[PDB]
Every structure is written in structure tokens, then in C-alpha cells.
Amino acid sequence: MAYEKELDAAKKAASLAARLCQKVQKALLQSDVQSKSDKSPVTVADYGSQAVVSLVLEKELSSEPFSLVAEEDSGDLRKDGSQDTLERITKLVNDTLATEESFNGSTLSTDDLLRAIDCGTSEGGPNGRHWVLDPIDGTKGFLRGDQYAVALGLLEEGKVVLGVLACPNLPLASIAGNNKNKSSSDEIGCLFFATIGSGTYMQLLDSKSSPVKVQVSSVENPEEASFFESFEGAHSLHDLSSSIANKLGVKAPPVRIDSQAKYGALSRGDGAIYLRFPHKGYREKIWDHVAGAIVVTEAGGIVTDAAGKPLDFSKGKYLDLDTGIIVANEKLMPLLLKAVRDSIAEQEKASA
Ligand SMILES: [Mg+2]
């Protein structure tokens, strides 16, 4: 694979972040109440995921200065007697970063933990090499035990060259194909990774099982195409997705995932089409799409905006794009593009 050394570091880092997150989610009292605590689990998982990712990549890739594009800093872990959360993350990170055989006698302190979060303060851009991390995508899914993911990408001169997706709750089999109705399968927890010109692979998380190459759906007719939707999201400019699907005449049931693991499922061929249209004023962040984009691309998928333009990750943290994001295979994308821009020119522009 291209960027083989970076790919190994990123798969190790993302997998360890998934262990830290699973250790929190399984510790959610195992009851629906969760001790009635605050967003403490979500915050310690986010800060903890970002911490272990930063600490692994920095140790594994000692050949280059570390540059990470992340949403959060350490400003919250300093005001108030927040050591209740600061020290619980430090104990949480050290415990997870104990099966490493590289840190060993290290046991990072509370000050070392917040330095790991503040050392990842990059702004992307068209120059240099930057890691792009979402420590937990699908915060609501993480709480309800649903689908969440750790997204880790790499930019090289403003272009995405590597994506890694860790989906601890995603099963290995097709979630869209509920027709299986099999047993518990017990094979749950996927790892998607791809680098430029090298293909997309799927592996069992924390398992020495061989990775398998994955491809997108070979669906030819829009009627049997399947759409990805949100587990809770109702509106979100559905009127576009509806009229687009109406002109396409889609009759297959939708697939409902509530995290960035939507990309991993589409790249293995569970669904055929994904359409995201952000609300007015909301600017899409690069850590929400960079890792999933190349995972889909390197599996044969087409990831463009509304105008058919490729997504450009060189402009910083935000992604200026036409309307939303359009994902499909080579055969469905041309018709899908016409269905979108018509629905954009129709019901949308018909307001005037
Ligand atoms: Mg996010």
C-alpha cells in the first residue's frame, strides 16, 4: 500500500482509540440510567480518543513533526476542579496505553495528557502533511449503544491520501441486508482503511484475521439502489433526498446508520447511495468526511458535491461545497447527478 508506514501507525492508533471508547460505553452502568451522570462519558471518550490517537501517531511516526487537525483543545480540562474528569481520563488513557509494549514504564501524568491534546492544533491547508481526526463521530449513537466510529485521515499537500475508520459496533455482515436475520453472528467490530491508489480493505477490529478487499455495490438500476439515512435525523433537507429518490424511483428500503460508519458500509456494498445536505449556516468540517471519502473512492465509489466537483480538503477545517455531498458508484452517479441538480433547480429554485 501507499503510505504503508503511516497506514500501520494509523490502524494501531485508531484501534486503540476504539478500545478506550468501548471501555467507556460498556461501563455505562449497563443500565439505561447510567447513574444519571452528565455528558461525562462522551467528553472523556472524546478527549481520551484524541489523546491516545495523538500519543500513538507521535510515537510511531518519529520521523516527522506531528500535525493534527482536531476540533477540541484542552481549555475545558483547566477551568474548575475538573481533575475529576482530567484524572479519570489520565487513568483511562494509561490503562488503555498499557498493552503497547512501547510506552511501558511511562504512566503519563495529568499535565502530559493535556499536552497531548494541545499538541494537535493544526489548521489543515494546502501545504504540508496533516492528520485529521474525529475522536468520536456519532456521539448520540455512542450513548444509545448504536453505531459510532473513529475517523482518522491524512492530508498530503491538501489531498487525502489515507483514511481509517474504526466502527466497534458495526457487524462484519451487511447491515442493510436485514433479510439475513441470522444469529448474533458474534463477528462485530470493523476496521476500514485505504490509501491512495491502493484499494479499500476491511478487517475485524482487534483481530489478527486477514483483511479483505471490499468494493462498492454494482447496482445498475436506480430502483434497487439503497439510500443511507440517519437513525434519528428526520428533516435535514429530506425534501431534496425525497424528490431525488422520486425521480430515481427508488423502492428499496433505506439503511439507517448514525455515524461516519455510513461510509464504511457503503464501501463494502451494503447501500448504493448516500446524500448529505447540511442545514443553512452550518459549515461541514473536514474530520466528518475525509477518512470516509477515500475509503469509498478506493473501493470504486464516486464522492462529489452537487456540481459533480470532487471534494477539496485543502481550504482548512471547513469544506466549501455545492449544496451537499453525493456518493454512489460509477453507474448510478450520472443519473443521480441529473436527479439532484434537477431537484435543486425544481422544488428548491421554484420557491422564487
Ligand atoms: Mg463530528
Swiss-Prot record:
CDD domains membership = PAP_phosphatase
Q: Which family does it belong to?
A: Belongs to the inositol monophosphatase superfamily.
In what tissue types does this protein appear? Expressed in roots, leaves, stems, flowers and siliques.
**EC number(s) of the enzyme?**
3.1.3.7, 3.1.3.57
Show the active-site residues. D46, T139
Q: Quote additional remarks.
A: Mutation in the FRY1 gene results in super-induction of abscisic acid (ABA)- and stress-responsive genes, due to inositol 1,4,5-trisphosphate (IP3) accumulation.
Binding residue positions for Mg(2+) 3: E71
Which gene is this protein's source? SAL1
Q: Name one Pfam family in it.
A: Inositol_P
Q: Which GO terms are recorded in the biological process aspect for this UniProt protein?
A: abscisic acid-activated signaling pathway; sulfur compound metabolic process
Q: What is this protein called?
A: 3'(2'),5'-bisphosphate nucleotidase 1
InterPro entries this protein is in?
DPNP, Inositol_monoP_metal-BS, Inositol_monoP_superfamily, Inositol_monophosphatase-like
Q: State if Hydrolase is listed as a keyword.
A: yes
**Binding of AMP: at which residues?**
H235, S259, K262, R276, D288
